[PDB]
Symmetry: D6
Subunit: 170 residues, 12 copies
Amino acid sequence: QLTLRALERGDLRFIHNLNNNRNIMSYWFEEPYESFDELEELYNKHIHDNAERRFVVEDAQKNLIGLVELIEINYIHRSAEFQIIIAPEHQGKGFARTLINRALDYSFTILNLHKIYLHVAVENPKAVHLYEECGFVEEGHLVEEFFINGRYQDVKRMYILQSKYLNRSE
Amino acid sequence: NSQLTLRALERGDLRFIHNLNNNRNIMSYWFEEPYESFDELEELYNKHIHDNAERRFVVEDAQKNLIGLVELIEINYIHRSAEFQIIIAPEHQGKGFARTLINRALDYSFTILNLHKIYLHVAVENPKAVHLYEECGFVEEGHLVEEFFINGRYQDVKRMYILQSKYLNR
Amino acid sequence: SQLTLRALERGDLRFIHNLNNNRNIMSYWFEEPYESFDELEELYNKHIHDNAERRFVVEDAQKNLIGLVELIEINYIHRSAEFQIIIAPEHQGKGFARTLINRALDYSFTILNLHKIYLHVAVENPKAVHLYEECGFVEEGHLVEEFFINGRYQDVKRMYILQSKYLN
Amino acid sequence: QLTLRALERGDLRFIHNLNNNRNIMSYWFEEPYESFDELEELYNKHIHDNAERRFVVEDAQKNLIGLVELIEINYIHRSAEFQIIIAPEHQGKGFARTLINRALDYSFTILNLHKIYLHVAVENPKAVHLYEECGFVEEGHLVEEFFINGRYQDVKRMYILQSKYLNRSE
Amino acid sequence: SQLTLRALERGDLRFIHNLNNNRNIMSYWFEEPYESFDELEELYNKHIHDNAERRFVVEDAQKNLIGLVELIEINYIHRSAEFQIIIAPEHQGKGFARTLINRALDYSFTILNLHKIYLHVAVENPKAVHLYEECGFVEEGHLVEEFFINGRYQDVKRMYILQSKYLN
Amino acid sequence: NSQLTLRALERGDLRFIHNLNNNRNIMSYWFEEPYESFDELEELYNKHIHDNAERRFVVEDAQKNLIGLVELIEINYIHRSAEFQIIIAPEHQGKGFARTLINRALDYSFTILNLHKIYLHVAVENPKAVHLYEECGFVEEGHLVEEFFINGRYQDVKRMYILQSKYLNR
Amino acid sequence: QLTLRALERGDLRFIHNLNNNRNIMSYWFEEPYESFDELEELYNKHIHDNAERRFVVEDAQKNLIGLVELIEINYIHRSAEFQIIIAPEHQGKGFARTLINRALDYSFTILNLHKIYLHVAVENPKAVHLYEECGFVEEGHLVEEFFINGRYQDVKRMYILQSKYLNRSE
Amino acid sequence: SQLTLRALERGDLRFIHNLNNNRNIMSYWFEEPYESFDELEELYNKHIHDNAERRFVVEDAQKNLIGLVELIEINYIHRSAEFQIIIAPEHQGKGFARTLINRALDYSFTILNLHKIYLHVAVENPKAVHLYEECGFVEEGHLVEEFFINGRYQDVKRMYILQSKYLN
Amino acid sequence: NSQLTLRALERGDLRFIHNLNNNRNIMSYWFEEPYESFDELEELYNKHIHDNAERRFVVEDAQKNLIGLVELIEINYIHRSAEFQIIIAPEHQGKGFARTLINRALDYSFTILNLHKIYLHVAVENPKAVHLYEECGFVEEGHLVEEFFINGRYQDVKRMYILQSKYLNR
Amino acid sequence: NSQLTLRALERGDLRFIHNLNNNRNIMSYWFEEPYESFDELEELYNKHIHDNAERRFVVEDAQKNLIGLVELIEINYIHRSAEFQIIIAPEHQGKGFARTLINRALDYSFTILNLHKIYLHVAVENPKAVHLYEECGFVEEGHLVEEFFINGRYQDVKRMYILQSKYLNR
Amino acid sequence: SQLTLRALERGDLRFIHNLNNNRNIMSYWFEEPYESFDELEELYNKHIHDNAERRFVVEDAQKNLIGLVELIEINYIHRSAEFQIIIAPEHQGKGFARTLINRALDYSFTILNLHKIYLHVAVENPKAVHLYEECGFVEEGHLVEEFFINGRYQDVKRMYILQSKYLN
Amino acid sequence: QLTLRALERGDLRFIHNLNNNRNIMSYWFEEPYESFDELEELYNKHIHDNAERRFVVEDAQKNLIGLVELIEINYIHRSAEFQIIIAPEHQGKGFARTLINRALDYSFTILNLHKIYLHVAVENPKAVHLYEECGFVEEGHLVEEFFINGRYQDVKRMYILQSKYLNRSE
């Protein structure tokens, strides 16, 4: 029922809405301010940048569900950072696990990456737990790494390896 | 009240900005010349799309009437300071929006941008505005003598500030 | 209160093009009455950010375009500028010049903080000379054969007014 | 009833038609081939070129009657070449003399030129005679100057001076 | 006679975008199935004048887009090129491949004056290998763990045909 | 007949040119590859707008149906020569337009461009076209051996010419 | 004995040395890091910028003594910020007062400015006192305005007016 | 015969830079005495092909640079220009001004075919006013508080001479 | 000791940097590929002249021998963090410069740039370097699993940090 | 004599050209203003490197002294005409080089460029030059009235020509 | 230990130009032996930042240039690259090839983290084929009439080695 | 003893000398005028043009002997035009046949071309004969193809095929 596809110029109004939402951008440790023009100019700049893959998530109806991104893709170390956003209107419909799996399938069966890692607020224990259920393991607890809502907060760095993902069941 | 929102300035808001920027009585509050072609406005908007030293916001109510403008300018990377400036459109002056909007600007400065100090300039000959700012936590740190040429003569201005520690501990 | 000056905009260029291609009108500015819309628009573009001029269109309360007022050669150090004005043919003879001249001076002296505004006017236009005198300008020069206009060289008055005089 | 005005981009389709007409271009010693794109690109190139003035001729109805041009304007010698075309549909309505006078008025009373000259085929004696009636005098008979319709042809160069034009009647 | 090859055009890019973002299809070309329309269109623009490739869309008599055929890495001296073809899902199983393969060879050999056409095909696609053999291609290589596809490295056949064989 | 006209190629004629340029049976007569995207065609058209070494014409009948193409290429400034090439669209082949169009091209070459020599190439294996050109005054000056690769083999072509003096004295 | 002249490209090595000196840049509230290339590229950028005047100070021997700058020159308000540096090797030779006077003469008798202001650390009372002796008066005491050597510090803003400078003695 | 005017060249810019940064000299031209060599050289470059000015350096027989003469704001239609001249400090008081003024007029009137040359001169420089009168210039304006110079606004004479007067 | 100095990287230091960047044993400490043409180095240096997100320093002794390199990268404007990296040239390893240089980098970060947190990466399999950093006040916040490909296999790295408040209060 | 050679103008000849172009007495023969900075000369030389409408030559003797300049300008592609102009440097005037150089220019025009007609302009008030040209085969085709402003007044000029057929059959 | 690979630099281009214009040498790479220094240098410039290749020059202990080694068509996903090597004529026959081949493999497998290195070698060069076999490469293709070389089409072996085999 | 190698920028002075020599350029039907700047700019333009190969000929001493070029290389028809120049000082030393063979070897054994053709004046029978001895055969006698030294002249077009060159001896 859910499909990941490449980000397109016609999806930019959707991204713009997310990028200016304080409560969504807080999960990505980003400032919730971006004019359409900054957004669109940065999109243009990175069209041919091989160090990132940005995906939009659609349901069968072709409602826009959210965003998945693989960034800082490094081709010697074969690692990338994974980050995901599910739009407020679709939060709590049970789609996260499916989309995490899609991202990992893409990473490990298409791009042939070795390692995917992510950052998650220590004060978001529900997401830490979801990630662990999907196979990620804590490799760091970064102290006062990000300033979020008036104070410095700690974050977990978590990872999963291609070997585990592909071979755990063997 | 909670009805008001601050959001990034967008290209579709420029006709509203053009109107304020060509209004002598609105520009006088910012000590700026009330002359700007749409082309100058737009080309400067284009020039500063990626300028990290400013944040320009448009104020809207629940029905999306444009209420005014809030800007943080001269944002400094080391000293962690910025200048706050505001414009409430004539038809909305005196409604009680100002205190709310000042608090929103400070929240953005202190809880998102992680700045140390916000300062502003306001005319000595506008004592009721000075009073309002005092009630909002700003304190006078300077009284600049004959600083700006306005309406045929030079005027004095107060320089007023507030620090992050004070805002966050009130 | 009825007449207002506002910055020249791209949508006003057809009006300007019309005045700029009118022989009678451009003779008051000592300018050649030929300018394609492309030359006009390209020069407009070129000077968007030029701090040395301020070009204004005059509008009545109904938003009819009445004329143009310009402050040019604005100098940073000397604090002087040249003033020029055109009232469209369909609106001359309605007594608007005085109001418009005073608005230009108010702008120069209360907003731009200039020290001196000067202008040039044909010696053969004594009515305009008299009007400028009534508004406080005084002759400081009688330029001999300064401009070629309709087959002959003509003389022009240079007239000025200071900030100190205007504000007092 | 006739008016000369600056050539505009919206008159280019009219010029294009003239510029591709063998029997009209022969009077100007030009090749009758010009794509709209060549025409338009050359127009663009010369927008700010002070060495030429191109005019379109209209009647009161605002029918396009023809073209008058002053080219190779030199500002030390104060001379320019005059050339005119009346569209086929308006030839023989007696407009040439009026338009020659307009061009001379412009040259001598606006641009303050000293001398206007023109070239006319020796085999176009009617035009040589019209020009003489309007004050031009032959200063040259250029031998085999131009290749026109399969052979080299001779042309008259003719001129008029500002002094004569302005002062003849005095 | 029903199917035709013609040059790829800008109006065909939505069709290509669809195939280029389809995982199943792009697996036949050993390519990553992600390409924004902007990347596609920008690369199209970049290669307009590139003599080293010829990209074709396949159309039936009704002008339905059936697939794509490409001649790439066309070499000037060696007179070789790589052939690749995609038939859209909605049109596979209709027996068009043979016709299309022959059209690509006709183009290469009767129009471009090439000496050799080669292709790559997954060892795990024996039906495609057999089809290419029927059309005159012969295996010249069995490339070991050449491409990573769906979580593992796969082997591919390299197959070729010469102009001399095709024309005789 | 006199119904046919030659005129400069224009941007609005390019869809017609695209059609001919992608037709294998039309391009074979010019020894050119029948593949050209509209973008290649248009960008090359743009590139050559001001190229004085060619003249490209479109043929139209009285009702403005597009009949074909005539081109003079490789026009040389010193040697006063050019290559003539023609295409009559399939639906108009065999109507008797060709002789007229060849005469129009020669008239343009000799009476307007003042060229000395026009030459052309035509397939030896198309003897009836060779004959037509002979009837039109062209004479064979070469028989180029295996000059062009066409349809899987090399073909010979005649090189045929006509001089200005012959055309103008017939 | 001392002369102020425009900054030149051959003075850039001198400026580079000052700009990378922690104890000199602290007086200007600037970070003491600037590659020659950043310096030179910024110089190039600002060649025609009318909002600043940068001067080098020489003695009769043509030793480079220091730097004087007028920045943020505003031509409606007629104000500018003054800042000065005397090289370490020339500190304490009694040149500051002379160079302050030179700067004020330039400001008020050449550029026709109305007001010059400066910023000086509250913890640099000797300089505050020198400035007062030269006619500047405190108009502000800016609280925690700048981060300097591990902590936020206060600064005085001080000014002098053209009227006072020119007319005090009258 | 000893003194000559020739076009300004790139190798003369150090001389100009020196005069342009000299307070006493630039006061005669009502200009700010600050110009980096880069601003000077960049402006020189910008105006290489500008037809509205002619800048000259003055040389004696030994090729010593004596001064500068400029014809600026040359107008195409009105056939007027402004003349300005500087004689380097080391060469003032040698009586060269008269010769140089006449050379500038010869250029304007016998080469550029101008109708009018005008200049501006400080009212507080009566010796220069007298010299220009001796060379045929006459006052046509007394501009009030036209330029700010050394802390105060000063008046300047505008003076002119016509081609007809010069050639006869 | 006090003999060592940090200063901005300059173009004349690039041959020294080229040497380190092409040394497999030096680059291994930074998890980077030891291949960089002088042209790549120089062009990237040019590209980043005005990049405010990094500070690159060269270390010199009293006699100006080049000792090594210190860099603060990924400097963030909001979170007030940066990554610290160091290289001591082979001939100067083991001399006792490292502790000094680490303290100099922290002083710059905390007393000039006003950063909140400095972190670094160091190989788990280089325990003595880990120990040194611990003695210098860094604490382990992560142990990144198979993070980098080095010499034919993946290696783990410690992520270690220090905060401004700790450095400034020691 | 046969000692003289014509060759293409080169960049290393521009100082010689600068000298002639700034000489009032040399430029008067061409009716041009004797003012040209080296930069104007050089930049125009650069602009016209590929201009096919002119051929500029430098004259040298056997010992390579620069003798003068010969130019063919306004070379027309259809009409097969050009304007001939010459300058003999002052020190070489009166030596008998002129007739030779005129014949060399005509040989180039008629035997290499295949032009039909060469014309020139020469002052009516320089009758001995007119005579020389007549002896060289040029014939007067015009007497242009007050064509050029020279030395304070307008002067008349002869327009003289020679045709290819006459030159080639003498 | 005597021989080293280092990145190609601008100062090494004369050496490369010499090899690139040598017919005998370039025949081993199936390349045309013509390249002006300007084409070479311009292409070098173009590819400075191209991540898909690594070009190396080989030096002995005395810094004499011995040869060139290149890793090209480096692929991001498949983790494959093509290896090619040239030893200058004056240095062939000294037994350096083995060392250099192993250095290229060490780079590919221990630094670039590649999965597969392949190469092409003329069937008519059995000595080179044997040397590559000794270094662990195995034939995966025999490409028929792949390259035109000295008047005829020649066959080439494609040979490969995997990371797993090299590291174990 | 003779070697062909790619043309280089340091050979341009040699080419310039040839390109300005009337008696050498006549063999190539080119105008003998080319400034160094035109030459060098055209060289630059064509650096990457795959449709030509330009070679210089050296002897063992590394004297520059002449030039060989393959131009208009077409990669579908596999044909190119061959042209050669031997410098005047080396004419008649018997090098032509060797250099023709070198060019043919390059064409047919390196570039894999099918056909090489050339143009040679009918009035240069010695060269026609040399070419025939080297295997070229006349395929055309082009009538009044080129204007050379005051009149139109005829030229032979001659060719040789790869099949003949490679297989004649088999």
